[PDB]
Symmetry: C3
Subunit: 209 residues, 3 copies
Amino acid sequence: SKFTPKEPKFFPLLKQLSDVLSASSVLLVESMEHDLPTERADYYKQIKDMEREGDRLTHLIFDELSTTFITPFDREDIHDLASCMDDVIDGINSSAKRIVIYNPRPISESGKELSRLIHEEAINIGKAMDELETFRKNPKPLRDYCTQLHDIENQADDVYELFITKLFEEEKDCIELIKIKEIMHELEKTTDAAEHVGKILKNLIVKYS
Amino acid sequence: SKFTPKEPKFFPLLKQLSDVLSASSVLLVESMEHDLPTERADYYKQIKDMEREGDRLTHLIFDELSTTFITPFDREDIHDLASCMDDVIDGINSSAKRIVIYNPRPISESGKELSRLIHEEAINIGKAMDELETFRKNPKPLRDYCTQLHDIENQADDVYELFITKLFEEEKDCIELIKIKEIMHELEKTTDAAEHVGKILKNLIVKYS
Amino acid sequence: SKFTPKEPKFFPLLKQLSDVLSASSVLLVESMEHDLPTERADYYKQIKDMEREGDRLTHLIFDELSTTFITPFDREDIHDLASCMDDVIDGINSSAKRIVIYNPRPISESGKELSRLIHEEAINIGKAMDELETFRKNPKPLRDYCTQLHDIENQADDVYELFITKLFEEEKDCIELIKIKEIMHELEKTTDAAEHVGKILKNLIVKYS
């Protein structure tokens, strides 16, 4: 009998989870360029497949954490990165779901912009995951990705706030107002969830400083 | 002075919490067969008593966890099972609350079906709790309860999605639409919370495999 | 080379976080006495500054926890106190945000009462933080602050329930109903979040009993 090392690849799993997030964000942006129910259902089904894969990967990370004593940085942060990235994926899925069930009129430029900001956050998150092996030597690149996520969330919240303010001043059809309010709310929660990933990363830098 | 063992009965407490959940689910199903405010208030008060008992039990589990060094399986999973079961109970309570404050017209077959699916999930959860002592020897029965919870949640989400889709196509009274949308949303969140219990159990099997 | 002690002041940080919460609650109460958008935006901006400071302090606590092996009481409870106090601050911020974006008519006495109850909870939380150093010797004062938080939340939920019940019976303008429903919902979630702080404190007493 001999010693056989465990190969929990926490970094590759976090990178794969980030890849799913980015793929999901691309699908959401594309979906909003289509207005009919059949096409919206197709995008939702594709996003749901990404959601199932993200959930699988997230649970694999948690299961590897629960059974491995040695981790590259503190286990709470690994757990939290995984859970928060999965929350973004779930927000993207919920947004697609709502578009299908509410069947709003063609999504305005503001909804489309929230989708583009979610994708920009996903790109920043993916680049941040490439820094997990080296932030202890040089935290600057990671730090800057965190600042960018913060800035994107400020822009997203403004887009959302201005849209809702105007929606309530202008839209007299209460049923259409409800539809788009619920979709837009899910989109803004998603952009906020993505910023929380940045917040975990920022504080990871602090803990190891 | 001698050694006196601590008898933290984690399994009995989890089973009692499951019993509260099941009792709550029975009350919710029954409540929907009554349409008048006085009867709905009575059911809500009864469910609220179950919610208080569930919250008590959940906090007892957490308090026993915080003071006991030895646990039958990992403490995070015990904590999470308790918290997630309590979330289902709280969702049932919130659903009953909403029915009282919104005072909708008699609940449709779709709302009633979501209540029946929550109860079916509660039954599966109760049977799963009977497997905590033996899943390490034979995980198959537990595994199968997890699969069933997954399937019930798929059915619940479809019930919800189809109802909302139709609601927005047909209901021209925006105030009635709001009432039932909020109740139905709480019901679908409850069915999803119950599936999360299954997800924790499924991964418990994986961790100990 | 010599030993240099780490001065993580967990109690002072929790007290400062409580101070931010209380300051935020004062601003929310004051804000509701003003009905025009410019004044509401000003209060929201001031509350948002408190939200940023609360979030900073919360993350400082978490970062000190992640790097310090010795804590005055269990780390999970410190983490949870910080996170739950921050959730109240965030609820106050969300409430102010909603008032700005929805632009409702002058807030009724019920909304104003929910703001006064949030402030009363904040006061109780601040007094509770003064008991963290001594609850092990004498838990009675802390216990009583927890009971008060519980009672305030019962009153808040009743205020909310009665307001919504009446709102749905009386308000025929669906767009105005939506505005105030969303604000009131955020206010009641905030009062509930504050009660959760009391629940953590109550169970802290139990764990150390």
